[PDB]
Design a binder for this molecule. Structure first.
Ligand SMILES: NC(=O)c1ccc[n+]([C@@H]2O[C@H](COP(=O)([O-])OP(=O)(O)OC[C@H]3O[C@@H](n4cnc5c(N)ncnc54)[C@H](OP(=O)(O)O)[C@@H]3O)[C@@H](O)[C@H]2O)c1
Ligand SMILES: NC(=O)c1ccc[n+]([C@@H]2O[C@H](COP(=O)([O-])OP(=O)(O)OC[C@H]3O[C@@H](n4cnc5c(N)ncnc54)[C@H](OP(=O)(O)O)[C@@H]3O)[C@@H](O)[C@H]2O)c1
Lengths: 383, 383
């Protein structure tokens, strides 16, 4: 069998020979009890670069040792590329959302042998779920593997927007001081109203982290959390996005991309937010209308916007989120920290082992299986 | 009486005509129960720029209503400055740590009428305390007014260093994507060992905010906290800084500048930290040896440094912290967010109202009074 694995390029300075620290903390389990991934073995040391071409997610010796062939490449765009050329032979396709091999219906129609599409990470919107259901393709992702990582990125970006971190760092590099230029748009987060769209693995983790900042917490999702959980964190639930955003100084989006959330934050919804509200989006790019975000930033309806997710990915050189005012963007990185890579690489291997040993894949990893949304997919997604 | 007040310049784009938001949250008290400042009146709306020359800390109408004069300038360095020229006459001198009117022994000795030195903010190391003591000068500061603001900046900076926020932002601006370049030094904070030097108003607030990030917490002070709080936040006490930093992935400094902390983090102490440790200093610049920090970053002993405090202030154009590798600096801004300004501006007025009506200044505002360290000064400072 042939496994088709798309990963991002090595660093332009070469694949690293050393690292800033000697190791990473050992993460045994996640909040709520889900165990860390359980592959029989890992062919890497946590802390190493696994998500790039040279890292191979630590998969080669395990796969080739079973008699399979593994194609690793970063070349994912075009019909004469390595990905789309190898696709008709692939039984298994793997890729990361940070450098996603888009599985369109046209590409799935060509992938005659494809049975398993693995998201090395969290979030399978780059796969056409409707077409995968149609063709009997199983879709899995490493649920929870980088949820905590993203929640850290969120609190970081909220604080950077509100406190005006990045323009202030820029005065340091320009040789200035310019206190009044830094702080004429610098506020404390303390006692602001913060609301999250979704209170799942990331959302709940953001709410727990936000709590000791003494903010007023808000959340909107289709199903409420346990009342006991709400009272312990001081949460107000809202039946609609609209009802939540109208009283929020800061909004975080932590929902998956599916028809319920596509183009959710458009001109209309953003106009219902508070004047000068801050918007953070580490979820998926297309949940916010690209031009509606730019446009509320230029007017001041949004005081700032930040996130790591774009559409498409990679973002083109002229993508307007690069140049819109008052942003604190990164490329899609929060879920591919070295710490997180250790977890979703182990989880990717666990899924493969389950596939090739004809053991069932963890129910929480599943998105679609047997021609339907299944597992976490039926809980979090819509088609 | 004459009040001489030193403030930073208005923005180079002009004193703002509008703000990103309509108001800021009203802060009633601080954690632990200390009330917010209690002036009889304020002549500003919270959220306005008060710490620049045009803001005047909202003091002019009040002071001139009583027949006093108020002289305001930013020109503060050297014997040939508006500040030094106006000083021999002043009964009261006010400045902010972010743009500090340094009250050396020489300047204090020439201030023939000086009886009160107020810090519009927190931290009175810019006043020579021994000379104030000897000359019978009251030194006061608005205790707690921006402690929470700094605790926010700290967590922002820890996350930025560890997750590698700023270089990844620059890849966005350069038109790139470059995941592996961003994340070859990107880590999660989760389960790292983090310790603070001091667990005071800032340091405790830092520890409370870091706890739900699931770090292992450490601290060092001169006075150990009781069991109740050490057990409630999972704190490990260390009897010295040396003992703390050798087990810490991340170190925060949150003590005042006095002889017990001057040059604390020198080459020798920094060399006992873990290889690849991250160092955050929102406390005072001189607590870290300027060149030792540069050396440790150039050698990889420190994986990152970040803070907002420099020496001297303003830092000159060629100050090596602007250009050392792997920094996430800002100018001195954390304690002068618009929200923090409302509090210490109200606190400056409360102190002046107490001065002129011969009411006692809040003991906790006091640093030196009656020829000795007093109030908070005796709790936190040494001479
Ligand atoms: N590097 C990154 O930036 C990064 C990394 C990982 C994940 N992500 C994104 O973040 C998504 C979620 O992460 P996760 O680990 O927290 O997954 P999760 O644990 O399954 O949580 C998803 C939550 O979205 C809720 N929600 C679903 N549909 C909604 C809707 N139409 N409106 C409002 N809320 C809705 C769901 O709750 P209800 O059923 O009650 O509505 C669920 O609680 C992922 O799918 C991925 O797209 C980004
Ligand atoms: N904008 C800014 O960046 C900003 C704003 C405000 C303040 N600051 C700086 O941060 C300092 C602290 O702020 P704060 O609000 O937390 O004042 P604070 O409530 O008095 O806290 C002072 C803490 O320093 C401790 N400490 C004192 N001497 C020490 C020593 N020799 N070694 C180790 N720890 C020592 C004290 O604990 P022990 O007595 O037990 O040792 C105390 O917990 C301020 O003095 C100021 O310089 C910066």
């Amino acid at each position: 069998a042939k496994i088709l694995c798309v990963l991002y390029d090595d660093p332009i300075t070469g694949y690293p020979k050393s690292y800033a620290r000697a190791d990473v903390p050992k993460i045994d389990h996640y909040p709520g009890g889900q165990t860390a991934p359980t592959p029989k073995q890992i062919d890497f040391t946590p802390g190493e670069l696994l998500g790039s071409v040279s890292g191979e997610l630590g998969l080669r010796k395990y796969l080739e040792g079973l008699g399979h062939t593994l194609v690793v490449t970063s070349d994912k765009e075009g019909e004469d590329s390595v990905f789309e050329r190898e696709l008709p032979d692939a039984e298994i396709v793997i890729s990361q959302p940070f450098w996603p091999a888009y599985l369109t219906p046209e590409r799935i129609a060509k992938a005659k042998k494809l049975k398993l599409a693995v998201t090395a990470g969290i979030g399978s919107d780059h796969v056409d779920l409707e077409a995968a259901i149609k063709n009997g393709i199983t879709v899995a992702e490493v649920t929870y593997s980088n949820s905590i990582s993203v929640s850290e990125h969120v609190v970081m970006m909220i604080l950077s927007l509100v406190r005006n971190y990045i323009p202030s760092y820029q005065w340091v590099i320009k040789g200035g001081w310019n206190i009044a230029d830094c702080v004429e748009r610098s506020y404390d987060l303390e006692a602001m109203h913060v609301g999250t769209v979704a209170a799942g693995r990331i959302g709940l983790a953001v709410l727990k982290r936000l709590k000791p900042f003494d903010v007023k917490l808000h959340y909107f999702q289709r199903h409420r959390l346990p009342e006991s959980v709400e009272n312990e964190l001081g949460l107000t639930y809202h039946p609609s996005v609209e009802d939540m955003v109208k009283v929020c100084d800061v909004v975080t989006i932590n929902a998956p991309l599916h028809p319920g959330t596509l183009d959710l934050f458009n001109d209309e919804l953003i106009s219902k937010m508070k004047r000068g509200a801050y918007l953070v989006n580490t979820a998926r790019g297309k949940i916010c209308n690209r031009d509606a975000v730019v446009r509320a930033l230029e007017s001041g309806q949004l005081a700032g916007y930040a996130g790591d997710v774009w559409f498409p990915q990679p973002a083109p050189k002229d993508h307007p989120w690069r140049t819109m005012p008052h942003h604190g963007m990164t490329p899609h990185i929060s879920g591919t920290s070295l710490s997180a890579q250790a977890r979703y690489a182990a989880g990717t291997r666990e899924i493969l082992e389950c596939w090739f040993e004809e053991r069932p894949i963890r129910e929480e990893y599943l998105i679609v299986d047997g021609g339907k949304l299944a597992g976490t997919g039926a809980h979090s997604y819509t088609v």
